[PDB]
Amino acid sequence: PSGVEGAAFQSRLPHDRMTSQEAACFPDIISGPQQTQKVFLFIRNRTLQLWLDNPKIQLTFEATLQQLEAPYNSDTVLVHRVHSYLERHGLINFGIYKRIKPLPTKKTGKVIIIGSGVSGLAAARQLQSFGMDVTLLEARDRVGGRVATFRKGNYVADLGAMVVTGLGGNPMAVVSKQVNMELAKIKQKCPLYEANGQAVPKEKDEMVEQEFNRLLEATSYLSHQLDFNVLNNKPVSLGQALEVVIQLQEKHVKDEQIEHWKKIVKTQEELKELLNKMVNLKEKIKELHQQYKEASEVKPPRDITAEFLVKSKHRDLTALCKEYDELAETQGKLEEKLQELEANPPSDVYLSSRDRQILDWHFANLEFANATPLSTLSLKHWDQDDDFEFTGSHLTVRNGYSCVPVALAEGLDIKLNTAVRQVRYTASGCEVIAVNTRSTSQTFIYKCDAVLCTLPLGVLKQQPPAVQFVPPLPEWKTSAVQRMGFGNLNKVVLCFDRVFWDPSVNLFGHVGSTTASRGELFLFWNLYKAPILLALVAGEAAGIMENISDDVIVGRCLAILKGIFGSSAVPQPKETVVSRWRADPWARGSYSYVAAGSSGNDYDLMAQPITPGPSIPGAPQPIPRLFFAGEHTIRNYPATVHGALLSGLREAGRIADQFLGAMYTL
């Protein structure tokens, strides 16, 4: 799409329909006449277009009305309501841009933001934009959180977020114009290499992949059509479903063979009855010939009964010979019908040990995508966020993704090396207690109106708690925390002095020996300027490999690489880094997934703020105090950078509405 309607698309909004959020802010319009709605929609779309066409400078209300035409520029308060709405909820003027209106003289309200990940930073910038007092508390000695970029000399490699998953409707598309990201497209061609270290033939590579894709659609069919979603009171996982489907396919292979040989025995048994009939006939033909021979011993002249006997037995012999020929005719037809069936049998097996191994790579890919064993993913919901996927090629931040959080961090009060230990929220306000990570006995107290918690789901999951909530988080919130899945996936960065791989290939796979190890170093990435190869440890392997030293892991890497490129073509790496995300105390994993027994609806529960009880009993219902952003709080874009980014924009909007009021709702 392009034009005004394209700007709505690039902002994840229907161009010709009002969203649920829009209905809340403009209930007058959406309940009103259809004509007004279309006016509204155009104003919204046009303003978005204006911002998107030039996102390096702030778009003021004045500048907006300036570029609007009649009859749309007539109602100036509608234009102001729209512009304010779009500014509040971070659809326009978000990220890094030159400010036309200088920051307000004095700040209103005070917000403490826990964590300076992308979600934290995105919110911070917005709240400061709205003229609030904002301080971020970060346990690490750097901003970015799960956006981690290794830098040494010329080597640059992301250990966390790495891929921009398409610019089509991506908020990162805006950011990429504001921040100098060297975005490079990823050619999706991925050659596979078996355990021995030799390429999978294009014969297999396609016939296995096609079967994989066919197997997934099958699980989807089991989920929706057959409603196979709960088994023995437990919720069915994607893994279970895939197993069930495969087994049914192995069953069909055998069912086919059984009914094929069953066809053979019936033909063979028809031949048996025909041969028995033929032997019994030759038996009689043999004897009847002898009788004719003996009857022909009576030489002429002979009486008529003796003549009759000769004639009679002659008829009876050619009559039975007629039968035998027709039975020998049938014999030839049944005998070739047996060579027909024995010529082309049904398939011998469903998948060979070589096939099943290549299929396991395809499963490992999925286990990398969801950062979890397929036995944990929800059958019904694992891919619920599919509809909201972006369009366009996937890209890599060639100069390292960290350039983004670092850029967002510019101009914000961020306390590094500050580990939040306790969050206290009451009717009158909040206090946050943190310690210095370096010397833990040194204590800090932060008093604020509102707390925005961007603690990773893994951190929120910790047992015993790393962060204490006073009062405890409500049942419904903590239940969502347990139900939701927080996965794990790790990276190995190999830095060489020379390129020994195919420079035109961005990624190549390695096929493991077992199902158990399908995720172990199963994929390699060639993305960066410097000679760097990046290897993935996914699925079950991810968790186990964290208890294994870097040297051993780098060894297994070189082993596989030598097997593929030549034993003396793979040098010793100059620099090596191995991530341990589940081990990391400020992450406790990689990113969330839809666990079995969870749904997309749990993500909504995560985003819902907390309102404390009253101080004095009988005092009025208080303001909401504790707010939640983060990758794990956005139903439609979970486990991503843009998803985090957006959740931060979301909460900043919600907090500003709560503490500065919404003047645009009138």
């Binding site: 890919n365 969801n370 991503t640």
Partner: peptide, 6 residues
Amino acid sequence: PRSFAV
């Protein structure tokens, strides 16, 4: 999520 898959 699924979109990460190669």
